[PDB]
Structure formats: C-alpha cells, structure tokens
Amino acid sequence: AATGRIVAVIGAVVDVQFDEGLPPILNALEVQGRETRLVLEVAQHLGESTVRTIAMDGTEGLVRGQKVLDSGAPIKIPVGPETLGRIMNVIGEPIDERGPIKTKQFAPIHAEAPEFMEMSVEQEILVTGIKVVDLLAPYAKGGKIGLFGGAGVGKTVLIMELINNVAKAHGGYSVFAGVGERTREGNDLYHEMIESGVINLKDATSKVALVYGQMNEPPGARARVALTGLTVAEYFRDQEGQDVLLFIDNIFRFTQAGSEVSALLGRIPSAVGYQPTLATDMGTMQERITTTKKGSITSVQAIYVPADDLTDPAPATTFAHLDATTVLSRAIAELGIYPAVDPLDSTSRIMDPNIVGSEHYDVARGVQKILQDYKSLQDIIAILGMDELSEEDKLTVSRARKIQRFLSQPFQVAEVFTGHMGKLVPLKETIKGFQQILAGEYDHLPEQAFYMVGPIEEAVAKADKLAEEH
Amino acid sequence: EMSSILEERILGADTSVDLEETGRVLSIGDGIARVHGLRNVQAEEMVEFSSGLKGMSLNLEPDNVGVVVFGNDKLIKEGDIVKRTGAIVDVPVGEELLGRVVDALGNAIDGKGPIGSKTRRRVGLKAPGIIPRISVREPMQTGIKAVDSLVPIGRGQRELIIGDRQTGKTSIAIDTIINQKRFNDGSDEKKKLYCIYVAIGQKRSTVAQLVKRLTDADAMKYTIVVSATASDAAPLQYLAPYSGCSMGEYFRDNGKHALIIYDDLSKQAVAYRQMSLLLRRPPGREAYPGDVFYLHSRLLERAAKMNDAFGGGSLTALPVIETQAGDVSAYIPTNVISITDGQIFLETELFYKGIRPAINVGLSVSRVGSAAQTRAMKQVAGTMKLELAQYREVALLSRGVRLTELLKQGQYSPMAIEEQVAVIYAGVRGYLDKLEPSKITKFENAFLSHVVSQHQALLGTIRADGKISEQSDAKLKEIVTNFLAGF
Amino acid sequence: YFRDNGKHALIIYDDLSKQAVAYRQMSLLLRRPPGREAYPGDVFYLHSRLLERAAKMNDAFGGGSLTALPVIETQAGDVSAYIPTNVISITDGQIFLETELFYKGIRPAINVGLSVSRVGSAAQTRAM
Amino acid sequence: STTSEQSARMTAMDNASKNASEMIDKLTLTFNRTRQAVITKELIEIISGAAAL
C-alpha cells in the first residue's frame, strides 16, 4: 500500500508525510527498519499530505525520513477462544512466550458502540460476598461497576477479592485488562490464575484472557490497551452470546495517557490540564463496555483518583458511566477499616425497594442514616467530647461506631495483612446482622467485637472471647 | 612523574579525524538548543557540543532539532557546531563503578581517574515484561529493627521512604547500605547486595559527607554514588535516576542483586517540571506536566526480580519522597505511592519526641512483606505487630510502650537479623514488662552485648537455620531470664 | 521639588490599587507577559521605585523631606493579595482600618493590634 | 459538689481549648494548601488564555 516518510518525532507523536495514498484516521502504520514491530496510529490530518500519529511503542532511534508503511486498516488483534489463557499487548502480540495466537479472525480495536435498540434493561443483584458492597451498594449482573480510590487505599485488593469470588464462581469467559498498572501485579495475577486452574497451560480449557499495557509503556500503548481488552470482551459477548466478565485496572490511566499525548498533538489544554476531548474519548470507550440484547458484560473497573480529589475531571467524568460506584476513602483506611469503602459515597442503581426488597432497602437506608448522624456529630464530639452529647446522641454514636466496625471484613487475599482468614458473608447474614445492630440487640457488646469479623455470629463469639479472656 | 604524561596519552590519543555529521546551533536558551542540521540524527540520541558539553536530541522537527543540554547553557553560543555520536543516550555500567562517585553521565568526580568500564547501557531502556519476573521471596535486610520486623523489604521490591524534611530518610538509606557489609564479606555470593545512591538536588557538601560516612564504614567498596546536586543543570538532575537505574540493571541482568536509592524523587519531579515549563508544555496540577507519573513510573518499573531463567537477579529501589507539612495526599507523593509496593512513613511528631527512627507503624506498609522475611523474624514480629496494633488501639498499654521504646535505634548501627530477633524476643515474651520503660534501651544495649560476647553459638544456629527452633527457643529463654536476674 | 529645596512635603496616593490596575491593563494590551492576577512582572518595581522617592535629606542636601501616605484598598481584608503584599513590603508601616471596628463605634476605625510604624517612636514628640 | 464541679469544668474547658487549637492548626494547613492551589489554577488559566493568541 502507501509508503511515507517520518518528518518529525516528538515523544510518542510522529508526523508522517505521504507522497500518495494518505491513510484514513485511526489506521495502523508500520515503521520500517526496526528490530521490534513499532505501530503508529493515525490521529489527525495536518494537510500537506502529512498525518500526525501516536506511537504504540518507543520512538527512540527514529530518524527523520525513515520509511513508514500503511496497513490499510486500524489495529487488528486476534479474537476468539484461542485468546483464553494468553497474555497479549496493545497490538495483539503474545507476551507470554507461548507462540502465536492462532485465531480464525481478527477484530479492529476501534468499533462503534451498540445502538440504543440493543440496550438491555434487566437488573439482577450480583452477590459478591462483601458486606458493605452487598448492603449499601449492591452490584448488578451485566452492569458497569467501577471502584474509585486514591493511591494505596485498596483498589487492587478489592478488585482481586471480586476476581476471586465472582470470577471463580463464574462460567463465562472473564477478561482482564491491565492498563497502566504494576507489571509485578500482572505477573502475580498470571501465576495465581495458573495455580488456581483458571488458566490452563495445557489441554486448553481456560476461561480468562489477559491484556496488559502497564506503567512502563509509552502513552500510546497505555491509551489503547483498554480498547484492546474491550475488543476481546466485545467478541466474547456478541459473536458468542456468552456472559462475559470484564475487569479493567486501572482505567484512569487511559485518560491520563490521552492527556500526556494531547499536548504534543497541538491542542489547547482544557481545565486542570487534561485534553479538551476528555469526555468524548471516555464516552466512545465506555459506551462499548455494555450489556446488549446479544450478550452480557459485567464490567468492574478500578478508577484512580488523583491526589484524592474526586472532582478531578477524570473521576468526575467517569461517575456518569457506571451503575454501581464503590468509593474508597483514605480517611477510613487510616482508621484501619478494610475495605475502605465510603458508606456515604457509594451508590447503586438497583438500590431500590422494588428490586432488593423492602427489608434490604430499609436496613441499608437506616445504616446510612445512622452513619450520617454520626458524621454530623463528629465535630462537636471532637471539640467538647462525648460527655456533652444527649443520651439519645450517645446511643446513636454507639450504634454508628458499631456499624462502622461491622462494615469491615477480612479479605481472603489480605491474610498477609489482616492475619485473619478471609470471610465470605452471604447476603442474608449481612442484612440480618445489620438489622440487629440497628434494632439495639447488641448495646452491651464492646465495639472492638465487630472489627474484622464475618457474620454477626462471629461478632458475638469475639465479644464472648474478649469478655472471658479480659 | 614525567613519563606518566608520554605514557600513552600522546601515542594513544585518538588524534584521528573522521567524516562527522554536524549541525549548527540556531538558538540556545532555557536549557534548550534549537540546532540546524543533523539530518540523520535519531530521536533521543546523544550529541556533543563544541564546548565538550553533551545533549539529548529530544524534538526532531522538520527544520531543526531541539536538544536538551546536559549542563550549563552558558557554554553554548549560536553558531556552535554540534556533532552526532550515533549512540542513544547511555552510561557506562559494570563492576568498575563500585567505589566511584560519578555524575549523571558516568564521569568520575572523585579524582581517582577514569572508570575502566567496558560495557555501556542505555538510560531509557524498557522494564522487563510479565514473564521475566518472579515474585519477591528473598529478604533485603536493612538492619533497622522497625523496618526489618514490621515493614520487611524483599529483593526486587520498591519501597517508598516518604516524610517531611529532616526526619531521617537518608539515614535509613545509609544504614541499609552499611548493613550489607556483613553479606558482601561473607561466602554466599547470592546474598551480596551492591548498593547505588543517586543524589538529586542535594547539597554537594551533604553528598561528600555521605561518601565519607560510607568510606569510614568501608561501604564504598561495593557502592556507586551518582551525584546530580543542587547546582547542576536541571537536565542532569532529570537524568541521574536513569543513569543509576541502568547501573543497577547491569547487576539485575547478570544474576546479581543491586539496591538503588533515589534521594530524592521529588527533586527530580521539580527538575522535570522546570524543563517542561521551559518547553512551554501545559502545566497540570501544581504546575506539573501531564507525564510526571510516567516520569517516575517508567523508572520505578525497572526495579524487578527476575526468575531463574533470566538469571535470577534483582534490583530493589528505595525512592525517597519529601512531603510538605506531612501532606501525603499531594500529587507527587500519591503518584509514587501508586507506583511503589509500600511506604515507610516517617513522622515529625515522632522524630521530635525522641522516637528515632520515626517510623509510623500504623501507616507504613509493605504490599509484599511477609513473603520476604526469615522464619525467626516472622515468628517474633507477628506477635510484635499484633501487640503493637493492640497498643495503638488503646492509645495492653505497658507492653506497647515497652515495644515502641524497643524499636528505637541509633544512627549508623544496623543490627544483624539474629540480634534483632533476640531483642524482639526479649521484648515480646514479656521479659521487661515490669522493667520501667526508660531503662529499656540501656537493658537492650547490655543484653545484646551479652548475647554477642558469650552466646555466639545460639546466634550462629539462628543464622544457619533461619528459624528459632524450640531448642533455641528455650535456650534464648534461659539466656534472657538469667541476664534479667543479673540486670 | 519641595524635598530638594529644603522644604517639606507630604504626598497621598489615593489609591495605589487603582494605579496598579491601570498599569495591568496597559501592559496586558501591550502584550507583555502576565503574572499573578495578570499583573506584569515589574508591577512590584512600579510601586517601589515610586515609594522610594520619599526620603529625608541630610542637612548637606537642604534638609528637606517627602512623606508618603499611600492608600490601599484590600478585598475582604485580604492583605496578602499581590498588590497589598508588594506595598506592605515596600513601606515603613501601615495603618489598618476595619469595617467591624467601623461599626462598633470605633472611629477612626484603626485596628491597633495590626497597625505598625517602625520609624514611629523616633519621630514622636517627647510629651506624646 | 460545688467544688468538684468547678474543677471538672476547668479541666473540660482546658480540653476543649486544646482540641479547638488542634483543629485550628489542621484547618490552617488545609487553608494554605487551598490558597496555593487557587493561585496556581488562576495562573494556569491566564497562561493558557495568553497562549491561544
């Protein structure tokens, strides 16, 4: 096809001048004369038969005038069941040293979002075994979830506990896309999925496909790897009808990489410093991760929050794309409460009495009401002390602290930190325990009897142990 | 000496002349040189200016080349000739650097002559992928009781040392470097740790005194010091961490174990912000460029632990971050917390209250942690951590006070793992619950001297086995009880 | 003119905030690079080289003087805004006026806890 | 009881003033942080507006 010449190299932004046969936007171009395959994705047409492109790998060693070849199609990755148990990078090459991925078809990573007449409405609660999640913000089968959190508050531990519970109990070809995360964590996940039998290195019956572009990758790879994993999941949903799980961690890195290349594309910076096209990029990417009438994609996404802002344009823009947000807090994690989910900031769309039932709904609303009352009291509690509160106020503070402690839970993936064995509290135990703590059936137990327990039976047992030993 | 000049300095003197490719400086300013020419120069290739300076070809543009000047742009004028070197920016690596102080480009600044390096390695290489790595298992001993017990560090890890100014971060790194002497002198060559100390934006006098502290402890013989101090150009303070990281990747790739300290990364982010703002790039939060996260993450991602098919080496990174007023929710602190595998929070309240090292045990964490402890240290430190959590909950109480005073340590005093285990054992079994607190340190001192002067056999058994067996358990029990009766 | 001829003058600028605003507009329209709150770089210079001409000449030069009473209008009592910062760092003291003390019947509404005069007591009369 | 109430009141008001000053210090830290961020944001607005000409 068409051949052109590099005319400018600035970071990950390469300008390529074609003499004839200009390539459409979003096409893939192969730089000629390199040891490893370097792919440039067309982003703009500058005129003068020049295009501007974003490089999917490093641009060092590139010389002005180097040959570039046009592929005639966007980045195409192999899609199919043969991707299960394999690791592939942003451009579909296997990075697990197990040979080529011999699939029958390749899909472009740029596609159109499903139409409005394909949207599905069904809303069925997805039980995760986590107390605060299943009580205050239940997830939904086939709904986008999203886990917001600052730096080091429990995003990856929570996403791995969700992986364990849901993905292991599942039967529908999970997919994991590591976007701008630690390569160490990717190796850990690969090997803990090899040992658990979810990835089968021989006699291939795997049920998870991994796609990884990590912190070490240039901005173009970190900006398109989410689309690559998204494409794998879209294949599993549409052309098989399967019920896919899709885990994305971390998806703020997509916006951040767009912001890193936006300056070099010559665009006036928006607010904060992000690209002017933040919301529409997030929309074109996030509207493809969706359940249709053809298949179901349960999408859990970790979302980094820069400097613990939550009003930074990237988290603020992500909020509108999710059905059940779970917001972790640093102030809570400094109290020792894990998972550090903020009870008064995590929402859900199925938190509706006509879906979860009046029992669940009323218990959740009461828990949130008592926690809100405690928060509003906290200021004069810490100024004057509790000795000045009303007796009803002392009761609301007591029950609120107890509910705080009961919301925490030891995680199976956190035995290395908690020392306790991981508990998986089913839904009715959660509802009943919290209903009882609300009613006042435990006004005599010490508050530390609820910290890091399973169901309320373990709380009463821990209280008995504390009372007898001490 | 006279013939030390005609040595070969004249005969072998590179007095060649070759057909070189050149460019001409159009405009020097803001530490960036717009250069005309260099048609075949590569992106990120090192060029050499007329004054003997060096630069990196950052912006290949249609009509000019933007060159980042590694030095003072005072020595560059418009019209200067700029030669290609054909080599993407790289630094000398090898074992010939151990004992040498160098600047960010690999040039010796210790006056001991040239580094006899035979290998060069690029500063901007890519970190290893997913397959070359393997989980952290081997302990990286610091010699500090608090760190080695509660916040263990393995080989191949990234552990942030974060805290305000003058809270003992450099002291922790220097003790970690001094502690590796007991391993580097031993026989097992899979426990030797070669240390690297990159000093960025620091006072040059402080770096000289650091090299002195390392030479007095005879730790320079296995330590590289890369120095890009406060008066050096911002591009040099930008490059220094990657130079040090390549010097450490040399050991990581050849089946050896390196440790690297970046002191600190906040100053490298400040230098990169200077360069970015002088390049008219859009400033984000706190005027930092959009890719300061990438700046630190492509660097701290090269600290890996290879598997036994890729050599089995490692590279441990201890990046340092200085917070303002104890704010950890700032931009760059949270960036590096997002990159690393844990933190060591040093506090000003603890440091001012005589608790040194002022490690906040409740906030310090090590995501890898347990997988890289010895068995004996694990045995005693599990109970110690449980009791410390109990004590901070109620802030038993006397046990907690006893333990926290047992965690104090002196500067330039890294303890072997056996002696830390002995002290923590004497603290965690209760054997000074009734000794009033202020004598504890004294007791500790005396106690350990006892255990090292007379019971060397028990310590040797702990060293050989790695665990404190039931036999050694009762042995240490009678030792500590007999001493306490004597004390 | 009066200072250099043995006489004594007293000049009031009412106020310097609006002079700084006029200069900011002028320079912004001359395309000069803006700084904090779009003030130019030398806007400090602007006032200092103005407020430094107020001096007390020794008797070898005539013995005259020129006293300056520049006025500054803060916003919500913010005295570390850019222009108040500059003019506070330039002058030899300040006389703080407060709305809250204005309405408490304290008139002139001089907040004495904040009002400063570094060369004050040396000028005061012996009786006072 | 009169005695043994003025004492309790004195110590309680001591605790109140101490806690109030602790909150004052922490809120002052946050205030300085916020005002620096505000200055930065307005400067970046002015600069990005000047760069579009």
Ligand SMILES: Nc1ncnc2c1ncn2[C@@H]1O[C@H](COP(=O)(O)OP(=O)(O)OP(=O)(O)O)[C@@H](O)[C@H]1O
């Ligand atoms: N473990 C310790 N025990 C006792 N004193 C200590 C200890 N560590 C440091 N100090 C003392 O406190 C001082 C702190 O110096 P240090 O360089 O270690 O802190 P820092 O975090 O690096 O501060 P800076 O930003 O200035 O480099 C040391 O000079 C030393 O005198």
Ligand SMILES: Nc1ncnc2c1ncn2[C@@H]1O[C@H](COP(=O)(O)OP(=O)(O)O)[C@@H](O)[C@H]1O
């Ligand atoms: N469910 C939990 N129980 C106990 N500790 C936890 C839990 N989740 C997180 N943590 C602690 O918080 C730290 C940060 O965890 P992680 O999720 O990996 O950080 P990040 O926010 O970058 O994803 C962990 O190292 C762990 O010590």
Ligand SMILES: [Mg+2]
């Ligand atoms: Mg994460």
Ligand SMILES: [Mg+2]
């Ligand atoms: Mg230091």
